[PDB]
Amino acid sequence: NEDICFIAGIGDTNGYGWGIAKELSKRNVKIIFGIWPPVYNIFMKNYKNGKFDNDMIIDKDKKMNILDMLPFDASFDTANDIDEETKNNKRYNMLQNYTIEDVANLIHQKYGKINMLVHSLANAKEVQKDLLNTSRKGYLDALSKSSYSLISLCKYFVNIMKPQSSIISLTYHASQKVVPGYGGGMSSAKAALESDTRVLAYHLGRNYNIRINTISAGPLKSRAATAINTFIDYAIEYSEKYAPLRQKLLSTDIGSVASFLLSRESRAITGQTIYVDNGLNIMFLPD
Amino acid sequence: NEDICFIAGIGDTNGYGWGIAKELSKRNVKIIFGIWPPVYNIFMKNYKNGKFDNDMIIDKDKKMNILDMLPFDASFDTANDIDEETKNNKRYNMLQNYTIEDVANLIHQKYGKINMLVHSLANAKEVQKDLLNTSRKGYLDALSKSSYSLISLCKYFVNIMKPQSSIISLTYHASQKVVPGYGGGMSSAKAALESDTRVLAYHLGRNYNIRINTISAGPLKSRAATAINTFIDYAIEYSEKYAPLRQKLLSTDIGSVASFLLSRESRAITGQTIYVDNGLNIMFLPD
Amino acid sequence: NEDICFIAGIGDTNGYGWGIAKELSKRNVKIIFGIWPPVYNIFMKNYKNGKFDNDMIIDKDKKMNILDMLPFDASFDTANDIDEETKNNKRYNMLQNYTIEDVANLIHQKYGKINMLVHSLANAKEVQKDLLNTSRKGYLDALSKSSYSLISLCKYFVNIMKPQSSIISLTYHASQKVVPGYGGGMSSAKAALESDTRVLAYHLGRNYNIRINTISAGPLKSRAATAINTFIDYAIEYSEKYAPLRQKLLSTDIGSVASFLLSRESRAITGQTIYVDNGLNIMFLPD
Amino acid sequence: NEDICFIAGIGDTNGYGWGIAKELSKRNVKIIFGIWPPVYNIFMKNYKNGKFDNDMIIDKDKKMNILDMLPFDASFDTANDIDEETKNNKRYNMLQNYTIEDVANLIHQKYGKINMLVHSLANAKEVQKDLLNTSRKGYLDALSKSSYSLISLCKYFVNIMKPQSSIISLTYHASQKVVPGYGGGMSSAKAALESDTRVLAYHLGRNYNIRINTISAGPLKSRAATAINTFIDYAIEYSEKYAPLRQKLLSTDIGSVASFLLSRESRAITGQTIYVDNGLNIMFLPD
Ligand SMILES: NC(=O)c1ccc[n+]([C@@H]2O[C@H](COP(=O)([O-])OP(=O)(O)OC[C@H]3O[C@@H](n4cnc5c(N)ncnc54)[C@H](O)[C@@H]3O)[C@@H](O)[C@H]2O)c1
Ligand SMILES: NC(=O)c1ccc[n+]([C@@H]2O[C@H](COP(=O)([O-])OP(=O)(O)OC[C@H]3O[C@@H](n4cnc5c(N)ncnc54)[C@H](O)[C@@H]3O)[C@@H](O)[C@H]2O)c1
Ligand SMILES: NC(=O)c1ccc[n+]([C@@H]2O[C@H](COP(=O)([O-])OP(=O)(O)OC[C@H]3O[C@@H](n4cnc5c(N)ncnc54)[C@H](O)[C@@H]3O)[C@@H](O)[C@H]2O)c1
Ligand SMILES: NC(=O)c1ccc[n+]([C@@H]2O[C@H](COP(=O)([O-])OP(=O)(O)OC[C@H]3O[C@@H](n4cnc5c(N)ncnc54)[C@H](O)[C@@H]3O)[C@@H](O)[C@H]2O)c1
Ligand SMILES: Oc1cc(Cl)ccc1Oc1ccc(Cl)cc1Cl
Ligand SMILES: Oc1cc(Cl)ccc1Oc1ccc(Cl)cc1Cl
Ligand SMILES: Oc1cc(Cl)ccc1Oc1ccc(Cl)cc1Cl
Ligand SMILES: Oc1cc(Cl)ccc1Oc1ccc(Cl)cc1Cl
């Protein structure tokens, strides 16, 4: 009782963020969605029009427990970072308090302190280009939004979290082994994310008694996965054929693991990269 | 509601085997203990005398549900491997059906098929010697009882397990990084165990849809630990002083993680080495 | 014969860049220094005043073979990236062709194609702050100069390198394990550098038959090492006391390894992170 | 000028042992071969008949300098370990002083102290069986001859080695990632070998200032390789098709790296697993 989780990085019901929300709901955790402004209105519309009613179904008729839905952009740390153009952009103009600091303050004011935080986002302008051809701007854009965002989320949210709270993010094996197609510096961003998870585990553990881990998920055909041009269909096919466990990897498979890591049951685990990919990562040569 | 777990390697209530049994009990899992013959009667004596009553208490009105307790020696695969020096041994003479295959048949004959298996045993005759001074006989003894026993357990128990069953063992970071007092080939045995966990994950996964993982636990002042050369006293002191999470590591901390890995909740995790050590493994230079 | 190496990241004779240059000279490799503009003039002055004559001594009277010394700033990819302020800054005003593209073109025009490239630089404005307190700007600054610079160096220099050429950079273990004190996102930058080394190994290997590896060096009291405030004295003391090899780590120790990796003798090694740290990285618990 | 290397594990000129001998010869290192008794006479026969003359050619007017060739069985530590089944064996009856301790004393008695040691042997009676179906006897046989033999070699040879000496062994990536046809416990043996290399690095480093590393080599169609179950044909085909460097891996490619690790040039490297496989180990999803 009293478990509140903020999930940053939800634009629909086809990604891991939604799978994580469903499993947490089964444990009676209250959910707060952090939605990227560019897709905020479209998300709300569909929600209002009851387009997600089926996907919100859990257990036996059990409906998901969505406490709130807030506009959120991990590119901005404070209101002072918002550039004039973005502030005046059509999709941002009518929204407020969407920077990392503002959302933390908003959540604290409305619901008090929370104990669960999920970083389920990533972005790279040049993801379609191989690392060698990625520009400096594209590279830094990937690191800024996909990696630094985690650090910033921690810096502002630790002030509104209870001791013994837990934090998780999502990564991918391309950080440790070569996956052609995963460009734009996304591999670089994930490698940084995994390393930052260890350093943050040290600081957050000693000073706040807070835990942080990352889940290296297998392939899922999410909206963003298609942006890589297809790459995702190949990855899924390869996984279902060569993984030690030949079964379809579901968003809820990652969700149940996320639920465990966020609960007090994983009290002694921190700074780890946990693989939830049907064991594919352990293979060397296929069959 | 129908889950049965065989825990191989319990001689008292101060080790990880007991902690795992306690946590699985909270989930209403029926427990069967595999006890090393040399200490079987003494264990039985204490149990009867109520020396473990307090250690069996769980939650409010809940007691640990121990289905059965059987003599079990991981040194012998089948009845044919029992030598006269053992058969004629005082402690073994009074016991029967304690080889790996016999225990599997006995359990199956009495309770049917099971779906959870825990390997929580290690043994090395020359653990007090550094690797360089360990004899061939001592080295092989460690690998035989601490590593091969996992493979043999799987070979014989898969026949009495249900599909989608799960298996776990315990390892230690000395397999990956140097820990001076961890001798006799125990470091070697743990390295083989972690690698074997991957290979078995592939075979058991493809052929039976069965999962297998290993938990790399932090220091716990248990019975066997005290045999290493005080060493455990150092390890614990160091862990509690430098680990990112400054809290005492409890056998049940490993238990709750084991319980999760043995349930369907971790359906997509296999062949992994999961660290449950308060994050100590991530540190390099002590602060 | 005909071996030319460009070493990017030399501001004096106290770092690894100089140690790498000395060892390469022993193999009769022609050296070209890439010097950061802010310290370019001071470097030349000392050189001219013969302040480095002693340090240039190799073998028996054998003097180093410095082919050229060029101003170089890894922050700029092309002349178009140079901001008006920097272009007009006192130390840059009188220098030309110091961007990555210009230096590559300059080298090609003056000496033709080369076959050896060394990335021996790093920088982070907020290195004195722990990761949690590093600003977005500081973080991206670290990644831009310490990691992306490697990718850019490769993109422009592969056009002026012969097939079978070799490239190396320098990293540090803080990317894999926690080292308190290594802040400003330097740990993040090194993790990215190591991951990018693997991805680049794939692209450069398949398309140009060029190799790339990185050396994870132990502590050396270089000029930059002092910028971390001391941290470096502690690291050196810890290393000389706990490493399996209790000896002083010299810049030339890294130099000789760099020489091997850059030569044709390491033909089958690529995408690797090679540790040259007296074996400290393999230790878990000290003595 | 005074370097002597003992290479344990040579039965012909198609393996890595020969490639290592060739490269060390270019450096004028005196070579002593340790030959498995069962094939000692045949080897000697071919040598006398000049069947290896072409394989011994190096550079222009340079021939491989083989100091001596001795029968050597890594299964026996001392004369006391020789059983009647072996002593009475036809192939062993005619030979003497072939245990590890005897060879060390014999070499020392004839040529004095040495400074280079190479462990290039592996053996597993049930290599054709997958791990799950490998017997205890077969599993232990693999660990005894392929892993413990390294420890015993160090224990007995340090007495006849000079300070600052170097040692290397060969391993394979199947210890870290799953390779289906690599059975009989060879994967287990390699995992132990790599871990043991770290522990030994600590002991030999602190006590004798002696270094030890292991080379993880790529596929090479050798004599023993052909015993795995064609498998080697697959491995080679896969390596040459997907590795970042599309070139044939030669025994001398491993030889040049071995030569470097055995020289003073690598003075600061110890306890490491160095990959010499054209970078194949860094790949995840084949392109
Ligand atoms: N889908 C997969 O196959 C897969 C594999 C490994 C890891 N994960 C990781 O899981 C996370 C989500 O992946 P997914 O596939 O479910 O994607 P989605 O399902 O695309 O989720 C990503 C979310 O990020 C949001 N987002 C983008 N930029 C943002 C910004 N600046 N501020 C705030 N939100 C922003 C998007 O609007 C979107 O809802 C990422 O970290 C991804 O790398 C996914
Ligand atoms: N104690 C720790 O700090 C620690 C750290 C890492 C991993 N674990 C691992 O957990 C397992 C148990 O450790 P523990 O500390 O709880 O020890 P215990 O508490 O000593 O548990 C080991 C059990 O093995 C049994 N055993 C020994 N030889 C046997 C044989 N031939 N057949 C059957 N059973 C046999 C013993 O009787 C004992 O009950 C081991 O694998 C150990 O390496 C423990
Ligand atoms: N010294 C150590 O203990 C140590 C340990 C591990 C790795 N290495 C790595 O070796 C490299 C050099 O380290 P070092 O200690 O010898 O340092 P130095 O000896 O400080 O070398 C770094 C060089 O980078 C140059 N530089 C900084 N910003 C630049 C820019 N924008 N463009 C071009 N040049 C720039 C400096 O002027 C300097 O000459 C770095 O990558 C460092 O992280 C060093
Ligand atoms: N062949 C490859 O592709 C490959 C890949 C990775 C690592 N390496 C490793 O290199 C080493 C040699 O491999 P290789 O392919 O050159 O094989 P060979 O070319 O088969 O070399 C192995 C040698 O071990 C000797 N041997 C076997 N049992 C022995 C015993 N009891 N005592 C003494 N010598 C004994 C054999 O007679 C033989 O000369 C092994 O450790 C192997 O695992 C080889
Ligand atoms: O990390 C991922 C891994 C896979 Cl296999 C599929 C999708 C992934 O997620 C992303 C990839 C690129 C961008 Cl730009 C944004 C996101 Cl969310
Ligand atoms: O693996 C372990 C790690 C630690 Cl820190 C403490 C105890 C451990 O467990 C053992 C060590 C040696 C032997 Cl002979 C038997 C066991 Cl059960
Ligand atoms: O990587 C390093 C590791 C160590 Cl132990 C010492 C110095 C290092 O190098 C740097 C650290 C911070 C900045 Cl800003 C620049 C450089 Cl060159
Ligand atoms: O380790 C190896 C790896 C590969 Cl790919 C090919 C051959 C190898 O070497 C062996 C394998 C099994 C046995 Cl019984 C003996 C040896 Cl020498």
Side-chain angles (χ1 to χ4, degrees), chain B residues 162-189:
Chain B
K162 302 173 187 174
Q164 312 184 321
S165 283
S166 183
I167 303 167
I168 66 167
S169 64
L170 296 163
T171 187
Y172 182 53
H173 198 50
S175 63
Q176 309 301 146
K177 301 296 183 178
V178 184
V179 174
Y182 203 66
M186 275 307 302
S187 58
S188 320

Coordinates of all heavy atoms in Angstrom, one line a residue, chain B residues 162-189:
Chain B
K162 N 8.4 -31.3 -14.5 CA 7.4 -30.9 -15.5 C 7.9 -29.9 -16.4 O 9.0 -29.2 -16.1 CB 6.2 -30.3 -14.8 CG 5.5 -31.1 -13.7 CD 4.5 -30.3 -12.9 CE 3.9 -31.1 -11.8 NZ 3.0 -30.3 -10.9
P163 N 7.3 -29.7 -17.6 CA 7.9 -28.7 -18.6 C 7.8 -27.4 -17.9 O 7.0 -27.2 -17.0 CB 6.9 -28.9 -19.8 CG 6.5 -30.3 -19.7 CD 6.3 -30.5 -18.2
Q164 N 8.6 -26.4 -18.3 CA 8.6 -25.1 -17.8 C 9.1 -25.1 -16.3 O 8.8 -24.2 -15.6 CB 7.2 -24.4 -17.8 CG 6.6 -24.5 -19.2 CD 5.2 -23.8 -19.2 OE1 4.5 -23.8 -18.2 NE2 4.9 -23.2 -20.3
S165 N 9.9 -26.1 -15.9 CA 10.4 -26.1 -14.6 C 11.6 -25.2 -14.5 O 12.1 -24.8 -15.5 CB 10.8 -27.6 -14.2 OG 9.7 -28.4 -13.9
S166 N 12.1 -24.9 -13.3 CA 13.2 -24.1 -13.1 C 14.3 -24.6 -12.1 O 13.9 -25.3 -11.2 CB 12.7 -22.7 -12.7 OG 13.8 -21.8 -12.6
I167 N 15.5 -24.3 -12.4 CA 16.6 -24.7 -11.6 C 17.6 -23.6 -11.3 O 17.9 -22.7 -12.1 CB 17.4 -25.8 -12.4 CG1 16.5 -27.0 -12.8 CG2 18.6 -26.3 -11.6 CD1 17.1 -27.9 -13.8
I168 N 18.2 -23.6 -10.1 CA 19.2 -22.6 -9.7 C 20.2 -23.2 -8.8 O 20.0 -24.2 -8.2 CB 18.6 -21.4 -8.9 CG1 18.1 -21.9 -7.5 CG2 17.5 -20.7 -9.7 CD1 17.8 -20.8 -6.6
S169 N 21.4 -22.6 -8.9 CA 22.6 -23.0 -8.1 C 23.1 -21.7 -7.5 O 22.7 -20.6 -7.9 CB 23.6 -23.7 -8.9 OG 24.2 -22.9 -9.9
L170 N 24.1 -21.9 -6.6 CA 24.8 -20.7 -6.0 C 26.2 -20.7 -6.4 O 26.9 -21.7 -6.4 CB 24.6 -20.8 -4.5 CG 23.1 -20.7 -4.0 CD1 23.1 -21.1 -2.5 CD2 22.7 -19.2 -4.1
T171 N 26.7 -19.5 -6.7 CA 28.1 -19.3 -7.1 C 28.7 -18.2 -6.3 O 28.1 -17.6 -5.4 CB 28.3 -19.1 -8.6 OG1 29.7 -19.2 -8.9 CG2 27.7 -17.8 -9.0
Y172 N 30.0 -17.8 -6.6 CA 30.6 -16.7 -5.9 C 31.6 -16.0 -6.9 O 32.2 -16.7 -7.7 CB 31.4 -17.3 -4.7 CG 32.1 -16.2 -3.8 CD1 31.4 -15.1 -3.3 CD2 33.4 -16.3 -3.5 CE1 32.0 -14.1 -2.6 CE2 34.1 -15.4 -2.7 CZ 33.4 -14.3 -2.3 OH 34.0 -13.3 -1.5
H173 N 31.7 -14.7 -6.7 CA 32.5 -13.8 -7.6 C 34.0 -14.2 -7.7 O 34.7 -13.7 -8.6 CB 32.3 -12.4 -7.1 CG 32.7 -11.3 -8.1 ND1 32.3 -11.3 -9.4 CD2 33.5 -10.2 -7.9 CE1 32.7 -10.3 -10.0 NE2 33.5 -9.6 -9.1
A174 N 34.5 -15.1 -6.8 CA 35.9 -15.5 -6.9 C 36.2 -16.2 -8.2 O 37.3 -16.4 -8.6 CB 36.2 -16.4 -5.7
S175 N 35.1 -16.6 -8.9 CA 35.3 -17.2 -10.2 C 35.7 -16.2 -11.3 O 36.3 -16.6 -12.3 CB 33.9 -17.8 -10.7 OG 33.0 -16.8 -10.8
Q176 N 35.4 -15.0 -11.1 CA 35.6 -13.9 -12.0 C 36.8 -13.0 -11.6 O 37.5 -12.4 -12.5 CB 34.4 -13.1 -12.3 CG 33.2 -13.9 -12.6 CD 33.4 -14.7 -13.9 OE1 32.9 -15.9 -14.0 NE2 34.1 -14.2 -14.8
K177 N 36.9 -12.8 -10.3 CA 38.0 -11.9 -9.8 C 38.7 -12.7 -8.7 O 38.1 -13.6 -8.0 CB 37.4 -10.6 -9.2 CG 36.6 -9.8 -10.2 CD 37.5 -9.3 -11.4 CE 36.7 -8.4 -12.3 NZ 37.6 -7.9 -13.4
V178 N 39.9 -12.3 -8.4 CA 40.8 -13.0 -7.4 C 40.4 -12.7 -6.0 O 40.4 -11.6 -5.5 CB 42.3 -12.7 -7.6 CG1 43.1 -13.5 -6.6 CG2 42.7 -13.0 -9.1
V179 N 40.2 -13.8 -5.2 CA 39.9 -13.7 -3.8 C 40.9 -14.7 -3.2 O 40.6 -15.9 -3.2 CB 38.4 -14.1 -3.5 CG1 38.2 -14.2 -2.0 CG2 37.5 -13.2 -4.1
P180 N 42.0 -14.2 -2.7 CA 43.1 -14.9 -2.0 C 42.8 -16.2 -1.2 O 43.3 -17.3 -1.5 CB 43.8 -13.9 -1.2 CG 43.7 -12.7 -2.1 CD 42.2 -12.7 -2.6
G181 N 41.9 -16.1 -0.2 CA 41.6 -17.2 0.7 C 40.7 -18.3 0.1 O 40.4 -19.3 0.8
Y182 N 40.1 -18.1 -1.1 CA 39.2 -19.0 -1.7 C 40.0 -20.1 -2.5 O 40.0 -20.1 -3.7 CB 38.3 -18.2 -2.6 CG 36.9 -18.9 -2.9 CD1 36.0 -19.1 -1.8 CD2 36.6 -19.3 -4.1 CE1 34.8 -19.7 -2.1 CE2 35.4 -19.9 -4.4 CZ 34.4 -20.1 -3.4 OH 33.2 -20.6 -3.7
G183 N 40.6 -21.0 -1.8 CA 41.4 -22.0 -2.4 C 40.9 -23.4 -2.6 O 39.6 -23.6 -2.7
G184 N 41.8 -24.3 -2.8 CA 41.4 -25.7 -3.1 C 40.8 -26.0 -4.4 O 40.3 -27.2 -4.6
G185 N 40.7 -25.0 -5.3 CA 40.0 -25.2 -6.5 C 38.5 -24.8 -6.5 O 37.8 -25.1 -7.5
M186 N 38.1 -24.2 -5.4 CA 36.7 -23.7 -5.3 C 36.5 -22.6 -6.3 O 35.4 -22.5 -6.8 CB 36.4 -23.2 -3.9 CG 36.0 -24.3 -3.0 SD 34.7 -25.3 -3.6 CE 33.4 -24.1 -3.9
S187 N 37.5 -21.8 -6.6 CA 37.4 -20.7 -7.6 C 37.2 -21.3 -8.9 O 36.4 -20.9 -9.8 CB 38.6 -19.8 -7.5 OG 39.8 -20.5 -7.8
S188 N 37.9 -22.4 -9.2 CA 37.9 -23.1 -10.5 C 36.5 -23.8 -10.6 O 35.9 -23.7 -11.7 CB 39.0 -24.2 -10.5 OG 40.2 -23.8 -9.9
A189 N 36.0 -24.4 -9.5 CA 34.7 -25.1 -9.6 C 33.6 -24.1 -9.8 O 32.7 -24.4 -10.6 CB 34.5 -25.8 -8.2

